[PDB]
Amino acid sequence: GMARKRLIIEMGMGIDQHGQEPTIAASRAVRNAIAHNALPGVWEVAGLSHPNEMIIEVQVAVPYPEQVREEEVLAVLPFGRKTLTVESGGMIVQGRAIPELNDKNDEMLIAIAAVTVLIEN
């Protein structure tokens, strides 16, 4: 692809409390990363005709990264030219499954997402 410049990086954490769903942790992390920010004008100032033209790169770190369903994670972003990378990281919290809380196994999975908005150089 064409070289690009980083504009803003939005970071967030997401948690799968029941276990076995790193995709859920990852999706929630992307949502958390962007939910508290709004981008009314940066895209204009950068020279785009619409926010859907912005380049958005997502970097996720989570346990069992190979189990993350990419399409579901990227669909959290409302617009843009989107890419995702998934790598091992985040954290596992070990603890005996609580049936009353609908736990699937003895792990809570925590993902981190960095959502970067870039402009082509």
Q: Which residues bind a second copy (CB under 8 A)?
A: 5-13, 15, 17, 28, 33, 35-46, 50-52, 59, 61, 78, 87, 89-91, 93, 95-96, 98, 100-102, 108, 110, 112, 114, 119
CB of 13 to a second copy, least distance (A): 4
Residues 88, 111: Cα–Cα separation, whole Å: 9
CB of 59 to a second copy, least distance (A): 7
Site for Cl ion in 8-67 (CB under 5 A): 14-15, 28, 35
Residues 113, 28: Cα–Cα separation, whole Å: 9
Nearer to a second copy, 31 or 69 (CB): 31
Yes or no: say if 116 and 8 are a contact pair by the CB < 8 Å rule. Answer: yes
Q: β-strand 55-62 against 81-88: which pairing, if any?
A: parallel
Sign of CA dihedral 111, 12, 74, 5: negative
The interface partner of residue 65, options being Cl ion, a second copy, none and the CB cut-off 5 to 8 Å by kind, is none
Residues 97, 116: Cα–Cα separation, whole Å: 35
Site size toward Cl ion (CB under 5 A) is 4
What are the residues binding Cl ion (CB under 5 A)? 14-15, 28, 35
